[PDB]
Design a protein around this ligand. Structure first.
Ligand SMILES: O=C1c2c(O)c(=O)ccn2N([C@H]2c3ccccc3SCc3c2ccc(F)c3F)[C@@H]2COCCN12
Ligand SMILES: O=C1c2c(O)c(=O)ccn2N([C@H]2c3ccccc3SCc3c2ccc(F)c3F)[C@@H]2COCCN12
Ligand SMILES: [Mn+2]
Ligand SMILES: [Mn+2]
Length: 177
């Protein structure tokens, strides 16, 4: 697959390894669901970048470790345990964060995410590949420079896919029919 080749050339080996592990843990084959493989790598990279600017990283851990970290936070802050695994915890605002990366309009994916979690407590932050974002209460958490770095990386991934004639397939596989 050209998409598997792109993933393994354009993503940090650590990202690729963790995304492969996450897909295996969740019974999906990176070699068949190749766009999903690219999506999980992209989202992981965004989560790491976000956390790197205050934050505990939940994403990128095996499931048992992720819930272990979540439980430890809830025990030491009294924040309520989320029903679904979030991506980060914010020690400044004392709230979990769900990060979404979408090839669709940010408002659509935001509504989908917010409908899934139904827990107002978890903060939602959505990024598109063209510099758009939508966040709970229009509170973007990060400053403008950090969000800019994230947006630039996402756009770069999109243009790399476009250079390789991969973007259209990737864009159409996010939502089913
Ligand atoms: O943590 C996530 C997750 C998100 O954080 C997310 O934003 C969107 C989607 N997620 N999920 C995605 C995921 C993450 C990033 C990009 C696409 C996908 S698509 C389905 C899938 C995920 C992970 C492994 C796998 F094999 C999958 F099929 C699963 C949902 O259940 C808990 C873990 N997780
Ligand atoms: O900036 C960082 C970075 C730190 O600033 C840091 O404190 C710890 C770790 N970092 N790094 C990690 C990183 C940061 C946060 C959470 C997980 C990861 S894991 C691999 C990875 C990083 C960044 C982007 C990326 F695509 C990666 F695959 C890399 C080291 O050098 C260059 C940029 N960078
Ligand atoms: Mn996640
Ligand atoms: Mn997420």
């Amino acid at each position: 697959s050209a998409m598997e080749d792109f993933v393994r050339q354009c993503f940090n080996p650590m990202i690729v390894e963790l995304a492969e592990k996450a897909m295996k843990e969740y019974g999906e084959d990176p070699k068949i669901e190749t766009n999903k493989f690219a999506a999980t790598c992209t989202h992981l990279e965004v989560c790491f970048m976000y956390s790197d600017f205050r934050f505990e990283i939940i994403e990128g851990r095996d499931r048992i470790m992720a819930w272990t970290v979540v439980n430890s936070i809830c025990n030491t802050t009294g924040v309520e345990k989320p029903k679904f695994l979030p991506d980060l915890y914010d020690y400044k605002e004392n709230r979990f964060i769900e990060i979404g990366v979408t090839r669709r309009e940010v408002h659509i994916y935001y509504l989908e995410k917010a409908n899934k979690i139904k827990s107002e407590k978890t903060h939602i932050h959505i990024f598109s590949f063209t510099g758009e974002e939508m966040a709970t209460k229009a509170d973007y958490t990060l400053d403008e420079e950090s969000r800019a770095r994230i947006k630039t990386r996402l756009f770069t991934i999109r243009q790399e896919m476009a250079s390789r004639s991969l973007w259209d397939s990737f864009r159409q596989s996010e939502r089913g029919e």
